[PDB]
Amino acid sequence: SRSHVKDILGLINTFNEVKKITVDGTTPITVAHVAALARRHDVKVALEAEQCRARVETCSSWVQRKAEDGADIYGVTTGFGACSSRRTNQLSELQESLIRCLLAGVFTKGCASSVDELPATVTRSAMLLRLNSFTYGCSGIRWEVMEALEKLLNSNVSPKVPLRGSVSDLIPLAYIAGLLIGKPSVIARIGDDVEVPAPEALSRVGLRPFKLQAKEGLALVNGTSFATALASTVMYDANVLLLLVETLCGMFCEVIFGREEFAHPLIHKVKPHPGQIESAELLEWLLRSSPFQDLSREYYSIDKLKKPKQDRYALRSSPQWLAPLVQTIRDATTTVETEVNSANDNPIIDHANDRALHGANFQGSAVGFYMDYVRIAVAGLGKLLFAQFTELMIEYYSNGLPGNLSLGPDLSVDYGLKGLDIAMAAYSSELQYLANPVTTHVHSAEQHNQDINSLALISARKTDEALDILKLMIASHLTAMCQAVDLRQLEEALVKVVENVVSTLADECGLPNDTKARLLYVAKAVPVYTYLESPCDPTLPLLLGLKQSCFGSILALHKKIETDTLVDRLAEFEKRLSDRLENEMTAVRVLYEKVRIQGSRFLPFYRFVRDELDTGVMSARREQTPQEDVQKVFDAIADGRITVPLLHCLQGFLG
Amino acid sequence: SRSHVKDILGLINTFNEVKKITVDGTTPITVAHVAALARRHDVKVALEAEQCRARVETCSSWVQRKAEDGADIYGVTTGFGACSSRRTNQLSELQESLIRCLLAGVFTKGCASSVDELPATVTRSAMLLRLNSFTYGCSGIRWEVMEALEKLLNSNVSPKVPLRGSVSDLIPLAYIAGLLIGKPSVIARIGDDVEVPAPEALSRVGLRPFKLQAKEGLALVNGTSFATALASTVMYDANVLLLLVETLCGMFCEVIFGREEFAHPLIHKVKPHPGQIESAELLEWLLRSSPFQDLSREYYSIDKLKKPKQDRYALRSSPQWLAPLVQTIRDATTTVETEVNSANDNPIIDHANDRALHGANFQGSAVGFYMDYVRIAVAGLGKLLFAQFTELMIEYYSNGLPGNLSLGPDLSVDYGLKGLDIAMAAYSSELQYLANPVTTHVHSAEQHNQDINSLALISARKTDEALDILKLMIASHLTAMCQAVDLRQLEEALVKVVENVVSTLADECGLPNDTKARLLYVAKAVPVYTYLESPCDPTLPLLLGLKQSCFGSILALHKETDTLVDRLAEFEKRLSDRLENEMTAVRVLYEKVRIQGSRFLPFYRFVRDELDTGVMSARREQTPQEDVQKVFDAIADGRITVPLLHCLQGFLG
Numbered sequence A: 001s002r003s004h005v006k007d008i009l010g011l012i013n014t015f016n017e018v019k020k021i022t023v024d025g026t027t028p029i030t031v032a033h034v035a036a037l038a039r040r041h042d043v044k045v046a047l048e049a050e051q052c053r054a055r056v057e058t059c060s061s062w063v064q065r066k067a068e069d070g071a072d073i074y075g076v077t078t079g080f081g082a083c084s085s086r087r088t089n090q091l092s093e094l095q096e097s098l099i100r101c102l103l104a105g106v107f108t109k110g111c112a113s114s115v116d117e118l119p120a121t122v123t124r125s126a127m128l129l130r131l132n133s134f135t136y137g138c139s140g141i142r143w144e145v146m147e148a149l150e151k152l153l154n155s156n157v158s159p160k161v162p163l164r165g166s167v168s169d170l171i172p173l174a175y176i177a178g179l180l181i182g183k184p185s186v187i188a189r190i191g192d193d194v195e196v197p198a199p200e201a202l203s204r205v206g207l208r209p210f211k212l213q214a215k216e217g218l219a220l221v222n223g224t225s226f227a228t229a230l231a232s233t234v235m236y237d238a239n240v241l242l243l244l245v246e247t248l249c250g251m252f253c254e255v256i257f258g259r260e261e262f263a264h265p266l267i268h269k270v271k272p273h274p275g276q277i278e279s280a281e282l283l284e285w286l287l288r289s290s291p292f293q294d295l296s297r298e299y300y301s302i303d304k305l306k307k308p309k310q311d312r313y314a315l316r317s318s319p320q321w322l323a324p325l326v327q328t329i330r331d332a333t334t335t336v337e338t339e340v341n342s343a344n345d346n347p348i349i350d351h352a353n354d355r356a357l358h359g360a361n362f363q364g365s366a367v368g369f370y371m372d373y374v375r376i377a378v379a380g381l382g383k384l385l386f387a388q389f390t391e392l393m394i395e396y397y398s399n400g401l402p403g404n405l406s407l408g409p410d411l412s413v414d415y416g417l418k419g420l421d422i423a424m425a426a427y428s429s430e431l432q433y434l435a436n437p438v439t440t441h442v443h444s445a446e447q448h449n450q451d452i453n454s455l456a457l458i459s460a461r462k463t464d465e466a467l468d469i470l471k472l473m474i475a476s477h478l479t480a481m482c483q484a485v486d487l488r489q490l491e492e493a494l495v496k497v498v499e500n501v502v503s504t505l506a507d508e509c510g511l512p513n514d515t516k517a518r519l520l521y522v523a524k525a526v527p528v529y530t531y532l533e534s535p536c537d538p539t540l541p542l543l544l545g546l547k548q549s550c551f552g553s554i555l556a557l558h559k560k561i562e563t564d565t566l567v568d569r570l571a572e573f574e575k576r577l578s579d580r581l582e583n584e585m586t587a588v589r590v591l592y593e594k595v596r597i598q599g600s601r602f603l604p605f606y607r608f609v610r611d612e613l614d615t616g617v618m619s620a621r622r623e624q625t626p627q628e629d630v631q632k633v634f635d636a637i638a639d640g641r642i643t644v645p646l647l648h649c650l651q652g653f654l655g
Numbered sequence B: 001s002r003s004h005v006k007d008i009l010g011l012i013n014t015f016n017e018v019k020k021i022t023v024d025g026t027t028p029i030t031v032a033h034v035a036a037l038a039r040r041h042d043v044k045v046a047l048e049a050e051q052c053r054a055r056v057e058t059c060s061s062w063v064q065r066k067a068e069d070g071a072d073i074y075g076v077t078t079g080f081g082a083c084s085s086r087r088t089n090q091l092s093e094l095q096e097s098l099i100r101c102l103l104a105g106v107f108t109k110g111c112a113s114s115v116d117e118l119p120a121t122v123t124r125s126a127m128l129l130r131l132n133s134f135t136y137g138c139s140g141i142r143w144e145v146m147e148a149l150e151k152l153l154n155s156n157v158s159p160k161v162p163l164r165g166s167v168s169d170l171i172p173l174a175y176i177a178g179l180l181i182g183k184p185s186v187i188a189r190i191g192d193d194v195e196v197p198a199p200e201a202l203s204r205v206g207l208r209p210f211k212l213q214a215k216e217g218l219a220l221v222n223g224t225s226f227a228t229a230l231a232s233t234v235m236y237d238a239n240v241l242l243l244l245v246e247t248l249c250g251m252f253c254e255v256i257f258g259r260e261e262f263a264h265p266l267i268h269k270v271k272p273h274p275g276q277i278e279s280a281e282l283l284e285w286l287l288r289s290s291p292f293q294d295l296s297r298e299y300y301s302i303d304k305l306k307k308p309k310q311d312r313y314a315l316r317s318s319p320q321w322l323a324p325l326v327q328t329i330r331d332a333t334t335t336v337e338t339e340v341n342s343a344n345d346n347p348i349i350d351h352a353n354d355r356a357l358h359g360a361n362f363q364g365s366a367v368g369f370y371m372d373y374v375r376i377a378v379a380g381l382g383k384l385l386f387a388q389f390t391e392l393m394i395e396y397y398s399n400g401l402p403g404n405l406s407l408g409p410d411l412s413v414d415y416g417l418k419g420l421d422i423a424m425a426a427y428s429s430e431l432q433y434l435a436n437p438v439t440t441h442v443h444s445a446e447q448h449n450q451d452i453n454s455l456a457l458i459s460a461r462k463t464d465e466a467l468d469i470l471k472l473m474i475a476s477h478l479t480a481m482c483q484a485v486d487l488r489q490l491e492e493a494l495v496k497v498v499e500n501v502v503s504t505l506a507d508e509c510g511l512p513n514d515t516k517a518r519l520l521y522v523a524k525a526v527p528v529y530t531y532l533e534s535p536c537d538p539t540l541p542l543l544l545g546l547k548q549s550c551f552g553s554i555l556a557l558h559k560e561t562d563t564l565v566d567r568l569a570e571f572e573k574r575l576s577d578r579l580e581n582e583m584t585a586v587r588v589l590y591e592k593v594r595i596q597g598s599r600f601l602p603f604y605r606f607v608r609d610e611l612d613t614g615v616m617s618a619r620r621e622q623t624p625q626e627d628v629q630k631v632f633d634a635i636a637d638g639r640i641t642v643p644l645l646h647c648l649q650g651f652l653g
């Protein structure tokens, strides 16, 4: 009882609008909240002392007292991992030595194969999840450690944490704990990337290092904070890219001359996968009384019995293809949010019933498996995009458009978007390779204690990487689409001048109505791009057609006029045509190189790309290289700037 | 609301209670209905005319009238696929030539790699779904063609169809169409192995070859019928096997001596993935007041500070592990059921509004992708199992159990379940490899008209294969668990006689009360399976411990020494003569009472009693194969669901 596009539209709004994240043990932190924190520095964290303070302090004292007495708890008085036989009564040194041994990652320096440290955005996200995790009053951590976390987030201090080492996130989390207790070997960023030792970093925000109490080290390092924080920003992005490609399907339909009936509600009602009904519903709305669908209907009414009666699968099958994709992206979002709003930690303190409970809430498998799913789904979005792209580039499938979307009339010096077409293959290829699962590679780890482990963080990173290739593919697809709209609008303007030339030239030469009828039919029916390079060349389809209609016309007539006179006028026709035709077509084209899109639901995307990002029809005469144009679009997608035209486009779809 | 375990119990009930599958275009066909049609031959199809004949006939008539007066629509007057440019008014033979071109699969003969045709259960399931898919009245197929499908189904006639060729299911469907039009080159089974050419098969059930009318060829061949039929039976199995392994996690707890607290509701309340809450809920109920959990806590109270305080992950993290798996299996079931109950076909006839709608309901992507997901989840189920099984085999982790669950005291001639142990690594490895996605290998097909295609049937087959490996692992896991229960029960009886012998021997010999106490404690604490092989060996853990205690004692008592040594000496003489014989007598008795109080009793009785097995040892002549084979094919049969239900009897809500 919703519709995923309202939900995603909902995420986008929360992302730009939110100023304050409420962390209080009760109000849900959403995936858009995590992304906003990571990405927008004006958004601050608010730990609400009125909510959780007391239940956090009751849990704090309960573990204080107790481990201090006899009490045999896994966290406080026991050894760790496969070493849980080792009991001890030295609470503070047990805790600090655990942090010490986990400080075991490695930083890279000139890494060709990957970033050589975990990004600050994800480290900060992880800080938020750890804090939030504590608000359930289940950890036994002190309230001040929590305040400290809050203040580090708000001042933009974060530890530098190694990319690898988590099997899901002891090691990564030890770098937060290390910062907190001021371990000199841990380096920390303060805003400007500027770097200092942890104790100096605590200094600059008015903190002193902590001495860990019983259970505090464990509560700090036990958790899925890194995997989940990253899966959160991954999911946010997957929702908006998803909505992005769905939307771009409607733009593809317009430029390729599709038949919008593929999206008719009865097709989908009768095969009612929610993702299929909802993506179709959106596409139907997008294409309703589009001016390009009118150009399309025109196109298939001319020589109807000679053109494909159906579109190819990349268009007509888009909703059926999108359905599982939207469904896995959507419920993966629900499950990572559930993780985000959980006490992931061990043991779990039940102070009400006076006991510690030994479980495994640190196990990140919910996220790890769902990351494997979404990476497969994004690979599928990429295959959608690559197929559409492919269709657009090939004249036998693009229904009138030139091969490679190449414009400049001389095709021997204009190879159009052929370089992008090649990159799309490269992009998609790498993308499919990345969608193999990570969860199938579990090793029995930590003295065979962790015989089952999620690899959540490794999987999130690979899905993170799949998304980045998707952005490249969308950037290219979108720029090709804009290129296609210009060619569609020029196509139409060229067809008119050819009609006007043929007509006014039939008039001047005294040609009969019969002859004029056929010649004009040809002028309307033959696609210009098949002959734009040399309009008067007898081997190209225009004159091929015209000359055929002349013979057919002299044959129908010849009897009660004069056959000899007809040929003379026809020769004069051809000669005037060799004088005027190419000239008129050129001027119309030159004029176009500095109107139907103006009425389309995709105007926002065309306008954004053409004049907000300042680009133009691609040709041998525009100085910009394909890189320069796609770069701009890509930067807009990477930035979030692409959501402005996306929301303008979807404005008032509601329901 | 809800609860996956209730849903799955619900499927098992439907599976063996249903008699008649209702096909009427309104009442849901469930994944259990497909599996029962496939597997039980007493279940028949009921094509229900009163419910859907009328929209089928109206649609049928619309097509016919659109075609008979000319003459432009994709199904009925156009060329197919990449040749949609081709218009013709030669409607019957157009349909004929479409089937002809799609009869393009290949049968294998002695294939080693694969079965070399699609199995009859899968083919019949496809027939059912193709039938159901026509009930919505969107296809234009004649009612009589549907009645023929019901008849063939109810008469166990089906075409032989090649395993491969679908990109998702033109080719495989062409063979069903090929039967219906009595094409001589397509061969059909009638029940008992026996094969006949299609024309003779129709003849045997009172049918005549159909001559196809406009749209009918397309209507038969356009569709997701084979992919979805396979995914349905796959999904049915994925549900019962899921439940089986969740339940087995509780049996593992019992035999490995775990702490049941890992399943405590507060732990999961606070990390609330429905699958984790729901699996922990089952586990909590299964282990509540368990007589084996009593032994576990009894075990951790002696020498507690030398024994681990937490269980390893395969047990303790099982709810967190299962959560994603139950969720993906559970909602892949919903999505295949949605497919089962849809008009997959093109064009869709909206006779109500006088138009043919051109789309792609034939595109089985929903199924294809969810099959890639389930395959990975069953890989996770297997990893859970392999880990539990590994822990059980290793003395350092099994908490008193002998390495390899090896019984017979003489270990140099008893290597236990080591063969199964090795097999389990082989199963898991292949399973993990199977879980790579198929949907990432989409090729641009059919003159680049199908530039996107689901590969759903191929994906369904690989998930099918994954599940088959999963059955092997559960079979071995289960039979290791029963072996383990016998060992735990024997262990208990053995420790009593050791305590008994030491005690009464200490008296016969007149040992001081301080010495007797220390000797008894050692008998309580030392795990028997560390010395069962040679109880009186000084270098083994018993005598070693006793001899220390005797030294501790003689130092402590200076409050007479020479005679205390004489009495200690006689103690060893006597222990040597009596201890092994007594343990052996008890062991022998045990070979042809705590499980009788276990909720896992039904599994133990079933395996031990109904399948007629015993404790594995050097003197039972049966091989491991022979015992696991019986468990395996009770799992393969569905017979394993009787003990499963008996085990969950009362779980309710």
Ligand SMILES: O=C(O)/C=C/c1ccccc1
Pocket (backbone or CB within 6 Å): A080, A081, A082, A098, A170, A222, A346, A446, B310
């Ligand atoms: O919670 C557990 O069982 C394990 C905790 C741990 C902590 C540090 C290192 C290894 C394991």
Ligand SMILES: O=C(O)/C=C/c1ccccc1
Pocket (backbone or CB within 6 Å): A310, B080, B081, B082, B098, B170, B221, B222, B346, B446
């Ligand atoms: O709907 C389509 O595009 C094509 C269906 C089809 C039918 C037979 C052979 C190939 C394609």
